Amino acid sequence: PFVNKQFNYKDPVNGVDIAYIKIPNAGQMQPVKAFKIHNKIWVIPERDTFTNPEEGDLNPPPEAKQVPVSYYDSTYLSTDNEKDNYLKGVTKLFERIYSTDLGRMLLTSIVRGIPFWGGSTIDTELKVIDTNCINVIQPDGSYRSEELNLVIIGPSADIIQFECKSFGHEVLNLTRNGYGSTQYIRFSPDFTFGFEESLEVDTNPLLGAGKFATDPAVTLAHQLIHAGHRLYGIAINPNRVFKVNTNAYYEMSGLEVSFEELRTFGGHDAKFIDSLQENEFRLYYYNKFKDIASTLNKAKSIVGTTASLQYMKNVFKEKYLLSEDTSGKFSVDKLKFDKLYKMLTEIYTEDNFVKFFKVLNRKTFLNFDKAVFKINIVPKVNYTIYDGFNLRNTNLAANFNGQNTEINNMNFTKLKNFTPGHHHHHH
Numbered sequence: 001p002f003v004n005k006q007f008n009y010k011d012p013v014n015g016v017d018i019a020y021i022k023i024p025n026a027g028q029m030q031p032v033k034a035f036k037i038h039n040k041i042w043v044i045p046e047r048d049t050f051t052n053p054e055e056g057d058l059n060p061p062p063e064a065k066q067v068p069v070s071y072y073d074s075t076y077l078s079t080d081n082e083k084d085n086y087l088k089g090v091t092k093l094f095e096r097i098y099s100t101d102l103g104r105m106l107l108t109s110i111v112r113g114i115p116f117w118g119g120s121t122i123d124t125e126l127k128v129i130d131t132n133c134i135n136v137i138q139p140d141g142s143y144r145s146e147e148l149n150l151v152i153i154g155p156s157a158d159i160i161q162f163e164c165k166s167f168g169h170e171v172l173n174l175t176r177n178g179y180g181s182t183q184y185i186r187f188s189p190d191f192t193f194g195f196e197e198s199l200e201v202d203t204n205p206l207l208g209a210g211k212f213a214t215d216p217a218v219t220l221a222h223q224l225i226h227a228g229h230r231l232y233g234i235a236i237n238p239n240r241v242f243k244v245n246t247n248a249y250y251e252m253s254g255l256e257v258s259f260e261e262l263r264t265f266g267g268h269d270a271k272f273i274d275s276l277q278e279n280e281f282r283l284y285y286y287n288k289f290k291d292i293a294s295t296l297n298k299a300k301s302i303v304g305t306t307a308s309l310q311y312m313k314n315v316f317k318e319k320y321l322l323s324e325d326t327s328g329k330f331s332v333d334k335l336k337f338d339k340l341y342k343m344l345t346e347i348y349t350e351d352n353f354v355k356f357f358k359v360l361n362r363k364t365f366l367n368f369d370k371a372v373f374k375i376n377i378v379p380k381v382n383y384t385i386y387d388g389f390n391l392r393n394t395n396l397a398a399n400f401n402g403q404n405t406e407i408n409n410m411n412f413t414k415l416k417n418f419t420p421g422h423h424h425h426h427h
């Protein structure tokens with residue numbers, strides 16, 4: 001959310017909001033410098049070769065094996081100067097998101113979305129799950145474990161493959177049982193995608209469609225919406241998909257977009273989602289929340305040194321908006337639940353963010369990107385918190401001229417065209 005202090009990648013470690021950390025994952029990775037820009041939210045301006053053991057390096061696949069919509073450069077984000085621009089880029093997008101009524105609400109929901117303390121084998125004991133924390137390095141080289149909700153980190157080998165990922169449990173499906181888990185969003189504020197479009201009326205495309213660029217704040221908001229679903233454990237299994245056409249057959253080929261995506265993008269694309277199935281999930285998650293309420297009600301002990309049981313129960317009471325009856329027993333407030341669920345699944349959408357931002361964006365999640373563009377959003381003369389690329393009092397404020405890649409050509413440097421025309425990428 002709003003970032004109170006101005007961080008520089010150079011600033012010294014203070015073990016509080018600027019430190020070296022290790023991600024709770026697998027091998028003996030070497031620490032990396034990280035910045036806590038808001039309660040529970042961290043930014044690691046490094047390439048992600050930690051979240052997945054199958055991606056320990058930045059070696060690009062052979063050319064013949066590369067997806068049409070992909071971009072590789074083992075060198076991006078490897079110098080302090082890039083990291084510093086990464087950090088300020090991400091921070092500025094958070095402020096742009098936070099600056100809208102919709103984004104302020106989403107970020108508030110994300111910060112209150114502490115992953116549940118369901119890591120004990122004893123059913124009456126609350127204990128944090130290790131993969132929902134990071135190890136902050138102390139002055140004396142020792143590691144101090146800290147809980148967090150979100151981490152913004154650089155992309156893996158393919159630079160434009162953005163996504164929201166998290167560590168799993170050996171038996172619990174944290175993203176789908178109402179528990180939630182720390183979310184790691186692979187993202188870069190240094191590149192954006194170009195698309196075609198041009199809102200017209202009846203008869204006139206002599207010059208062809210305009211060539212525009214996607215505002216990075218929308219691309220980040222998209223990932224954060226996924227994070228919202230997952231922090232609250234109400235994500236939908238990606239194998240659950242819906243066919244999106246006409247003239248096509250099922251089997252889930254031709255065109256079947258996952259339920260998760262259609263709901264995240266929203267707008268005209270959220271009408272292809274089966275209402276009943278949608279209704280079933282809300283009931284299923286409402287129940288998951290009820291189970292959590294009983295777990296809290298039956299809790300007799302807690303693991304950890306600083307936090308007291310009552311303290312944690314209250315943390316979760318605020319998260320899941322539970323009712324605390326006349327006897328102290330927690331219950332799921334149907335009124336408050338419905339609202340929370342609705343907000344998380346249908347108010348927080350890419351479509352709605354596009355409205356608040358007043359930007360041009362693909363109309364249907366089913367649009368095709370044409371190219372990748374190098375950009376630099378840090379300079380206030382290139383991009384602002386309130387206008388993005390369509391700077392006011394310049395010829396960039398009308399007709400999304402700021403997003404137009406021909407007009408505002410000094411703000412977009414093409415790195416590659418996506419040769420085939422047909423498929424997707426995603427998010």
Ligand SMILES: [Zn+2]
Nearest residue numbers: 226261264427
């Ligand atoms: Zn998505």
